[PDB]
Structure 1
Amino acid sequence: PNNLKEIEQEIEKVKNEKDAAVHAQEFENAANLRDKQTKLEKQYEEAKNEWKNAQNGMSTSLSEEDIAE
């Protein structure tokens, strides 16, 4: 639902940014990025779990409209 998409993208760019710091020996910034990534993943798990939890709230059923299409 257009939420875990962008959140996952931020995790990707953060990981690349940390890799650049590691190869450049900029460990001062790398330490901050490591904690930031953990923050992103922590909220990522909660956001995904609540989404699938709400998915079970409603049941997807077919209808003659779908077959008509």
Structure 2
Amino acid sequence: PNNLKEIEQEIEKVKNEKDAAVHAQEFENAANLRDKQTKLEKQYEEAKNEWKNAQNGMSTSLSEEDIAE
């Protein structure tokens, strides 16, 4: 529901930036990048947990409209 794609992209770009900075020997910002990545991972886990709980709370019954479509 347009909630995990953004966090996944942010984690990917943070990882790419950290990998680029590793070759350039930049550890003063590497700690900040790692902390941001960990926070984004925690937020992604929380969002996934709440989304799966909400999905499991409801029942996806099949109606005649699906067959008609």
TM-score, scaled to structure 2? 0.95
Unaligned runs of 5+ in 2: none
**Partners of 2:51 and 2:3 in 1: CA distance:** 10
User: How many matched pairs?
Assistant: 69
**Partners of 1:64 and 1:18 in 2: CA distance:** 51
Q: Give per-residue Cα distances to partners, 1:9-40, cap 9 Å, x unaligned.
A: 10000000111111100111111101110111
Unaligned runs of 5+ in 1: none
Deviation of the 1:57 alpha carbon: 1.3
CA RMSD of aligned residues (A): 0.7
Identity %: 100
TM-score, scaled to structure 1? 0.95
**Partners of 1:35 and 1:66 in 2: CA distance:** 46
Between the two structures, name the one with larger relative contact order (CA 8 Å, sep ≥ 6): 2
Deviation of the 1:46 alpha carbon: 0.6
Q: Give per-residue Cα distances to partners, 1:39-60, cap 9 Å, x unaligned.
A: 1101111110000001111100
